[PDB]
Write a protein that binds this ligand. Sequence first.
Ligand SMILES: OC[C@H]1O[C@@H](O)[C@H](O)[C@@H](O)[C@@H]1O
Ligand SMILES: OC[C@H]1O[C@@H](O)[C@H](O)[C@@H](O)[C@@H]1O
Ligand SMILES: [Ca+2]
Ligand SMILES: [Ca+2]
Ligand SMILES: [Cl-]
Ligand code: NA
Ligand code: NA
Length: 258
Amino acid sequence: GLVPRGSHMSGATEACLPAGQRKSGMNINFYQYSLKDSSTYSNAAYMAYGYASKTKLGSVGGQTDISIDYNIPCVSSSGTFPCPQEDSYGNWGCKGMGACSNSQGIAYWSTDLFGFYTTPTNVTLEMTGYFLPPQTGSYTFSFATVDDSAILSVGGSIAFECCAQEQPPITSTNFTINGIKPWDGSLPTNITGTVYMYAGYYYPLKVVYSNAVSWGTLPISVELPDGTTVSDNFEGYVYSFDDDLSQSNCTIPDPSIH
Ligand SMILES: OC[C@H]1O[C@@H](O)[C@H](O)[C@@H](O)[C@@H]1O
Ligand SMILES: OC[C@H]1O[C@@H](O)[C@H](O)[C@@H](O)[C@@H]1O
Ligand SMILES: [Ca+2]
Ligand SMILES: [Ca+2]
Ligand SMILES: [Cl-]
Ligand code: NA
Ligand code: NA
């Protein structure tokens, strides 16, 4: 046939072709989250959009290194240094530092999350941008682990609306990765998600991440159609565009036929 038939039952992921000035990296918005609140972030509605009802603390733009690896301080005999959680022991010390005098359960202030001065012990953040596939095919996004709660969404009308990156979050709970902290205290079951993507189209991408106490961890990767994996640093893959709600042709509902 002269043309491709298109993905079955209109199943292709919606993408965009914003015509404005492209900027490298993703925008990160920070929102209030209560220390030791282990319930709020277990709700899908909260993780999809409810987070933005809380106080907005600030933002940073142009971020290409997007994994989270926040370690709390150990106030030790030789000074105060961050402690890798796997090196924490007893009640409590940090291997190579001796006993720590400080509490694991209070808020700590730091610029570790994207250079923004906040409380990485207790915070919710929203990463937005567009993912640009260099190759046509199946992409598998992954979280290596989640502490405390997280989602990843890809696609127009799922992550956000085309050419409307800066708008209040949309209500879709159709997550690409559901890493929401289970109520049952369990581990989130599936922390990978696959999307078929067409080279050169801009795919809206949203990551919402929350921490309630102490350590925070979110190692983000993507496996490309060629089988290679990009981890942590998504430079060359992720971009931002200022809103242009007047660009009529910005949405591509079916890139499999466009
Ligand atoms: O914590 C999120 C990001 O913050 C940035 O300031 C760091 O340079 C990155 O290594 C990290 O992925
Ligand atoms: O409530 C779960 C908590 O368990 C602790 O072992 C982790 O270190 C915290 O970072 C986590 O938030
Ligand atoms: Ca829509
Ligand atoms: Ca934590
Ligand atoms: Cl030690
Ligand atoms: Na860590
Ligand atoms: Na520290």
